[PDB]
Amino acid sequence: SVKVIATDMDGTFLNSKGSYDHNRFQRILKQLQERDIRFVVASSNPYRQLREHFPDCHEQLTFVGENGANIISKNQSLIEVFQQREDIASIIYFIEEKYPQAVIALSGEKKGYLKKGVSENIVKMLSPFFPVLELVNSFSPLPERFFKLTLQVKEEESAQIMKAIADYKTSQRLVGTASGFGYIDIITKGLHKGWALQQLLKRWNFTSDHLMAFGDGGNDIEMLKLAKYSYAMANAPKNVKAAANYQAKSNDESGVLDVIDNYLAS
């Protein structure tokens, strides 16, 4: 009895080439709509970057970006929660002083920011997760309103740095969540994809019993635990599989659309 379908993007809905079966999807979408089944894109990426994947139908979908702080539906802003400048400045000072190896990117309403001096190769890596990317000589004072920050770090120091963040004075406001191999999103504490879906379920008057959800990452775990019909991609790591009730094929075998066509076929 599925009424909302929510999917992660990178590593899940998207294949390893960063694309998906457009035709198969649009035909599925027509089906979902005529059944009043809601479709939710739930990603750490900014909304502006998520809509580009759905050029011809984005206005018919709901988007959860920034892991949760920004929600758009029907091409309209439903929720936008910004971090406090004082908190941002403070966690930045802490990371610069304590973990100089982490590359810091700020994710703003309209663009992203890196510090000048970051290597071209990093700039080239990140520039994909941002509409526009501006380089500044300092973060103090700050530039725009910001949904989240992103740290690029060695995957092996990831846990340590996340714990350092959780133990810092900004603790009640800011928390890290693994948003990919070698990445930590510093989000407003509690504003994760599970929270986002709860807000949408509560607003559409459904329960988690009607939720089907797909993920492959740490930042998908609250969402997966929430959804009764929770799917870890075949390519997800053990801990993310632990949070799911069902396993899908890999993102390179259209694992998401496969499950959806299966449900519909039911």
Q: In angstroms, what is the minimal distance from the CB of 239 to Mg ion?
A: 13
Max distance between CA atoms of the chain, in angstroms, equals: 57
CB 139, CB 93: distance < 8 Å: no
3-state secondary structure of 204: coil
Q: In angstroms, what is the minimal distance from the CB of 117 to Mg ion?
A: 29
Residue 8 vs 222, nearer CB to Mg ion = 8
User: How many angstroms separate the CA atoms of 182 and 59, rounded?
Assistant: 32
Spatial neighbors of 118 by CB under 8 A, at least 6 apart, are 103, 135
Residue 49 vs 90, nearer CB to Mg ion = 49
Where is the chain broken, named by the residue before each break, C–N > 2.5 Å?
143
- What is the number of the residue whose Cβ is closest to Mg ion? 11
Residue 54 vs 139, nearer CB to Mg ion = 54
Indicate the annotated binding residues for Mg(2+): 8, 10, 216
Q: In angstroms, what is the minimal distance from the CB of 174 to Mg ion?
A: 21
Q: CA torsion angle for 23, 65, 115, 118 (degrees, to 10)?
A: -40
Residue 217 vs 255, nearer CB to Mg ion = 217
Catalytic residues: 8
Residue 112 vs 217, nearer CB to Mg ion = 217
| Closest by CA position to 240, among listed 255, 259, 224, 261 | 224
Q: In angstroms, what is the minimal distance from the CB of 245 to Mg ion?
A: 18
Q: In angstroms, what is the minimal distance from the CB of 8 to Mg ion?
A: 5
List interacting residues with Mg ion (CB under 5 A). Answer: 8, 10-11, 216-217
User: How many angstroms separate the CA atoms of 58 and 211, rounded?
Assistant: 20
3-state secondary structure of 9: helix
Show the beta-strand stretches assigned E in the chain.
Answer: 4-7, 38-42, 62-65, 70-73, 76-80, 103-108, 112-115, 133-136, 146-152, 174-178, 183-188, 211-215, 229-232, 246-247
Only one residue has tokens 């599970």, namely 194
Q: Which residues pair with 108 in a beta bridge?
A: 146
